[PDB]
């Protein structure tokens, strides 16, 4: 028998493949499952996660900090039009609100 090669290495990805396949099969979503669906799903999920994390990390540098806290996540999510449209009815714990005042109450 030859040496085992992980299926994630063949497709050049980072997210797992077998776990997604098993979860899809065991969740009784359909009677049968093909072959390329786990690969497609893993690629899409990896792309979305990378985009969101990159935006959050870029936003978190302004406060002269190093780590990431949910305030930075909220600030990065609410400042992008498409991401705001996607997460339209989601609440994040300890998020706060964007600074915004009306134009009539000002002196």
């Amino acid at each position: 028998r030859a040496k085992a090669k992980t299926r994630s290495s063949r497709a050049g990805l980072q997210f797992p493949v077998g776990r997604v396949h098993r979860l899809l099969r065991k969740g009784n979503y359909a009677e049968r499952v093909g072959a390329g669906a786990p690969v497609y799903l893993a690629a899409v999920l990896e792309y979305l996660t990378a985009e969101i994390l990159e935006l959050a990390g870029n936003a978190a540098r302004d406060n002269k900090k190093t780590r990431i806290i949910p305030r930075h996540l909220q600030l990065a999510v609410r400042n992008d039009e498409e991401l705001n449209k996607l997460l339209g009815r989601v609440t994040i714990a300890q998020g706060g609100v964007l600074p915004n005042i009306q134009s009539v109450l000002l002196p």
């Binding site: 063949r10 497709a11 050049g12 990805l13 980072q14 997210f15 797992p16 776990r19 997604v20 899809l24 969740g27 979503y29 359909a30 009677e31 049968r32 499952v33 093909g34 390329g36 669906a37 690969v39 497609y40 799903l41 893993a42 690629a43 899409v44 999920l45 990896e46 792309y47 979305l48 996660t49 990378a50 969101i52 994390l53 990159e54 990390g57 978190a60 190093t66 780590r67 990431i68 806290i69 949910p70 996540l73 498409e82 449209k85 996607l86 994040i92 714990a93 300890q94």
Partner: protein, 94 residues
Amino acid sequence: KTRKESYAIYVYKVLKQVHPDTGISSKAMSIMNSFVNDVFERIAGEASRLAHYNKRSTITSREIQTAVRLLLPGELAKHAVSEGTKAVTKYTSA
């Protein structure tokens, strides 16, 4: 005790790949885990419904592609679709 699974190592690897020097806390990990689970559930459910509607019992790449095009709004969706195709091609190569 029993063993429970999560999505910590992969998220950390992606973060290290994108930004070289940047840490993270536990709350961000929990939020990322919940977000990934929710998105996966939504996409899989939509794909299953669409596959069932056409009097056929199989989930293949076409259903996933149509569900992705239906769910994600705007330019984002476009990019995602392209990415997916490339991955499949590599699997065909080897």
